[PDB]
Amino acid sequence: VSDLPNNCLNASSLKCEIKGISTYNVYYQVENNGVIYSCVSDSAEGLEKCDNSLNLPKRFSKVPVIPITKLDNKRHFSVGTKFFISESLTQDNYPITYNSYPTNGTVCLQTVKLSGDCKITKSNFANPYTVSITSPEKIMGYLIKKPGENVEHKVISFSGSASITFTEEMLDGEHNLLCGDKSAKIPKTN
Amino acid sequence: DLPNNCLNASSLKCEIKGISTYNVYYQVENNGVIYSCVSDSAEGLEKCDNSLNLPKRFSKVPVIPITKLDNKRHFSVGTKFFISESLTQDNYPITYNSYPTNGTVCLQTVKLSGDCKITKSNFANPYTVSITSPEKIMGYLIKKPGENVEHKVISFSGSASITFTEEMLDGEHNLLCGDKSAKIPKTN
Ligand SMILES: *[C@@H]1O[C@H](CO)[C@@H](O[C@@H]2O[C@H](CO)[C@@H](O)[C@H](O)[C@H]2NC(C)=O)[C@H](O)[C@H]1NC(C)=O
Numbered sequence: 001v002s003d004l005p006n007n008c009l010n011a012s013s014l015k016c017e018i019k020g021i022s023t024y025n026v027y028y029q030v031e032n033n034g035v036i037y038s039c040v041s042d043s044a045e046g047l048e049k050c051d052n053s054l055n056l057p058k059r060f061s062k063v064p065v066i067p068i069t070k071l072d073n074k075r076h077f078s079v080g081t082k083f084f085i086s087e088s089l090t091q092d093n094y095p096i097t098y099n100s101y102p103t104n105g106t107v108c109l110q111t112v113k114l115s116g117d118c119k120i121t122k123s124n125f126a127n128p129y130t131v132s133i134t135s136p137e138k139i140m141g142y143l144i145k146k147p148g149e150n151v152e153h154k155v156i157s158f159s160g161s162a163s164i165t166f167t168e169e170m171l172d173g174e175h176n177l178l179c180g181d182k183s184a185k186i187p188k189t190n
Numbered sequence: 191d192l193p194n195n196c197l198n199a200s201s202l203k204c205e206i207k208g209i210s211t212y213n214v215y216y217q218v219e220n221n222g223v224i225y226s227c228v229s230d231s232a233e234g235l236e237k238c239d240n241s242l243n244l245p246k247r248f249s250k251v252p253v254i255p256i257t258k259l260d261n262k263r264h265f266s267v268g269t270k271f272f273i274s275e276s277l278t279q280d281n282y283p284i285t286y287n288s289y290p291t292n293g294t295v296c297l298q299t300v301k302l303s304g305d306c307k308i309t310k311s312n313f314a315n316p317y318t319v320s321i322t323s324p325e326k327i328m329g330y331l332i333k334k335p336g337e338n339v340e341h342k343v344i345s346f347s348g349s350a351s352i353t354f355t356e357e358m359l360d361g362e363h364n365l366l367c368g369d370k371s372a373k374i375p376k377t378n
């Protein structure tokens with residue numbers, strides 16, 4: 001029971017400090033016996049007493065996201081930010097634990113986009129403004145977004161299948177339905 | 191200007207800050223002010239400090255950061271620089287491939303990306319497969335998990351014929367192409 005990564009787990013038992021809050025995970029370090037451990041988690045549990053825990057959300061959405069690498073489709077696909085492990089630019093890779101995985105590296109904060117398999121179809125059952133989204137993965141996210149908006153905390157998580165009926169404000173020619181790695185233009189009403 | 195001083199290292203005091211497998215991160219000085227820079231073009235940087243291992247060309251196959259640390263050993267094809275956000279809310283101006291922005295530079299272990307289909311065509315050599323891809327350029331590599339093979343990645347357009355070597359026929363090498371991986375079988 002080698003418990004190196006465990007130090008990040010009991011943080012209800014240690015002096016803790018949040019260093020950063022992203023849309024989908026938290027960046028914090030904890031002290032034990034004078035040694036500092038860096039941690040990244042997608043779970044907000046037990047971090048209430050940490051310093052800088054003021055804006056710690058109720059829970060984190062667990063939808064699959066990946067970094068946006070082409071900067072010009074940032075406005076289109078952005079759904080917030082997340083913390084990632086990366087390599088040090090000065091080779092000072094320090095020990096750090098990511099979602100209870102021990103590793104070496106540093107912390108990167110990056111704007112992210114939805115990802116994963118999501119099937120989009122137009123439904124027979126209601127109307128051309130009702131769509132069905134399905135996914136073989138445990139959790140899949142979708143977001144309806146006009147480019148440039150800040151609707152980052154409106155990612156909806158679903159398991160297996162869901163149905164959406166577009167509102168009228170969405171039925172201009174500028175709203176896109178983002179689901180997993182997919183983007184589909186939402187039609188104009190008339 | 192935002193990209194001007196930075197597409198202009200040949201005439202200025204340049205300094206390379208890092209060289210990844212697929213691009214270079216440098217900075218330039220003009221009239222006393224420093225400008226950060228990220229380019230996948232090696233040209234014009236010869237005069238920069240720390241230029242010894244600056245390659246002739248950077249491969250331009252699409253690559254994206256590995257987000258699940260577990261399957262790093264299997265898919266890794268080197269490292270690349272990317273723009274990120276300041277953790278301390280101090281975002282400075284950077285030019286990425288002549289695209290100007292605010293942010294921070296990140297260095298991330300990277301994997302192959304894009305659409306690639308592994309179809310084993312009927313040929314005369316048992317060890318020859320055909321790969322297809324609709325993208326303008328696509329990349330592939332033969333590696334065994336953990337193999338430190340970077341700069342062994344191959345560009346191709348439309349299609350390509352891969353003729354396996356002997357060593358690759360241990361059941362431990364994978365055909366990485368785009369976002370696809372396939373296991374090279376044991377044959378005797
Ligand atoms: C992270 O890096 C450390 C080294 O800083 C690795 O831990 C061992 O550290 C000793 C120093 O006492 C080195 O001599 C060893 O080479 C390292 N062990 C091994 C097996 O490589 C550690 O393994 C690295 N990875 C993780 C997940 O901690």
Ligand SMILES: *[C@@H]1O[C@H](CO)[C@@H](O[C@@H]2O[C@H](CO)[C@@H](O)[C@H](O)[C@H]2NC(C)=O)[C@H](O)[C@H]1NC(C)=O
Nearest residue numbers: 191192225279280281282283284290291292293
């Ligand atoms: C993001 O980048 C823009 C680039 O135009 C910044 O805008 C100006 O940047 C120059 C230096 O690059 C400063 O001297 C100006 O004071 C900036 N402000 C304006 C209004 O032009 C901008 O400050 C950067 N940051 C943000 C949050 O947009």
Ligand SMILES: *[C@@H]1O[C@H](CO)[C@@H](O)[C@H](O)[C@H]1NC(C)=O
Nearest residue numbers: 003006009010011012013046
């Ligand atoms: C660490 O402490 C937490 C309670 O804050 C508990 O969930 C966990 O089981 C503890 N682990 C060990 C090894 O004591």
Ligand SMILES: *[C@@H]1O[C@H](CO)[C@@H](O)[C@H](O)[C@H]1NC(C)=O
Nearest residue numbers: 194195197198199200201202
């Ligand atoms: C960059 O360098 C050239 C070198 O002749 C210089 O004249 C000018 O400042 C810049 N030119 C361009 C096209 O950016």
